[PDB]
Amino acid sequence: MDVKVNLPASTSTPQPRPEKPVYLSVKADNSMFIGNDPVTDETMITALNALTEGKKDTTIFFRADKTVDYETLMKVMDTLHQAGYLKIGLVGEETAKAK
């Protein structure tokens, strides 16, 4: 008793490529979670470039959880700063200060 069986199957579905704004969202001690596109603090740059095709000339909103520490915001800033990003909108924050 022996026979070679197979599981043939195929499905043709659409694949639209719409355009939408870039919105960042972080939570916990330090965890990035984009809309249906979760990432880490390590692949944050690589992933970002893979999604925005490496475009730092786009107004991206930086949404940081209310449970973020000073060290976290200091790392993300210094990281995105050295990695470019010269146009990052500050969500829920439009106030300036100097002294």
Swiss-Prot record:
- Which keywords are on file for this protein? Bacteriocin transport, Cell inner membrane, Cell membrane, Membrane, Protein transport, Signal-anchor, Transmembrane, Transmembrane helix, Transport
This protein's GO CC annotations: cell outer membrane; membrane; plasma membrane; plasma membrane protein complex; transmembrane transporter complex
According to its UniProt entry, what is the function of this protein? Involved in the TonB-dependent energy-dependent transport of various receptor-bound substrates.
Keyword DNA repair assigned to the entry: answer is no
Q: Which gene encodes it?
A: exbD
Q: Which domain of life is it from?
A: Bacteria
Give any single GO term for biological process: intracellular monoatomic cation homeostasis
The name on file for this protein is Biopolymer transport protein ExbD
Q: Which organism is this protein's natural source?
A: Escherichia coli (strain K12)
Q: How does it assemble?
A: The accessory proteins ExbB and ExbD seem to form a complex with TonB.
**What subcellular locations does the record give?**
Cell inner membrane
Induction statement: Induced 2.1-fold by hydroxyurea.
**Stretches of the chain found on the membrane's Periplasmic side:** 2-99
Record family assignment: Belongs to the ExbD/TolR family.
The way it spans or sits in the membrane comes to: Single-pass type II membrane protein
Q: Does the UniProt entry include the keyword Cell membrane?
A: yes
